[PDB]
Amino acid sequence: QVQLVQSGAEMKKPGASVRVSCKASGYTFTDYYIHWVRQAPGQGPEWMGWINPSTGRTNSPQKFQGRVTMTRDTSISTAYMDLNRLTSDDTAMYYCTTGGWIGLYSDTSGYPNFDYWGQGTLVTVSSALTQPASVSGSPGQSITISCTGTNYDVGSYNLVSWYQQHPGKVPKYIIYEVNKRPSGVSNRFSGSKSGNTASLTISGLQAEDEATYYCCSYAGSSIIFFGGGTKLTVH
């Protein structure tokens, strides 16, 4: 019963600071990376950072590099995210997810493998990878969503993961490492890759498949990219 329980919704004024909590249970806290992600209203997702619970090493991208302070408390097994200098642009839903396994012989920090998600923390203050805007299909058909990157990411790594999101719901693990399927994932989803473009394939399209689909990839110096998103419509 792996479960991540985040802090309560908050609303802050411009210029303030905010702390979001995340208490994980049902597994060993110090063996899995913790990632922080957020979602602006109407917009898509934006990767905020990763943190090693065991060592305390954290890295966030170069747009949060001054404002975000990610910490952890091992005694109580709780991750913390602190954001400073808030603006109307920081109004978003904040998720913490579980990353790759903290290994001796590897480095799974930048693995976009978010199998477990929190419930989300709504905070209100008052392009990266290219996906097509919308893709249409009729029931029974087979459709494909494309995800174009560069040579330094999806060109040189088989480290792309696909996530599904219904409106008002938490993102869902669909594909990881380009082609592989997690537990419970319908066999209708398959992953593919060519050059600087990965692709998610849905065969026997159905009404349950109506949602927005995002693609995640490695991004170079221990950083992760998110896609813009693609809306599937079922006729």
Question: Can you put this structure into words, describing what you see?
Answer:
The structure is a monomer. The chain starts with a strand and ends with a strand. With 235 residues, the protein is mostly beta strands. The protein is built from no helices and 19 strands. The chain folds into 2 domains: 1-126, Immunoglobulin-like, CATH 2.60.40.10; 127-228, Immunoglobulin-like (Sandwich), CATH 2.60.40.
- Sheet with the most strands? 6 strands, mixed
Q: What is the string of helix and strand elements? A: EEEEEEEEEEEEEEEEEEE
Shape category: globular
| Backbone CA Rg | 18 Å
Strand order, sheet with most strands: 2-10-9-4-5-6
Indicate how many domains the architecture comprises: 2
* SS field, number of helical segments: 0
CATH topology of the largest domain: the name is Immunoglobulin-like
Count all strands and give the number: 19
* CATH homologous superfamily (4th level) name of the largest domain: Immunoglobulins
> What gap, in angstroms, lies between the N and C termini?
37 Å
Which second-level CATH architecture of the largest domain applies?
Sandwich
CATH class of the largest domain: Mainly Beta
Helix content: under 10%
Proportion of β residues? over 45%
PDB class: immune system
Keywords: single-chain variable fragment, HIV-1, antibody, immune system
Assembly: monomeric
Entry title: Crystal Structure of DH270.1 (unliganded, single-chain Fv) from the DH270 Broadly Neutralizing N332-glycan Dependent Lineage
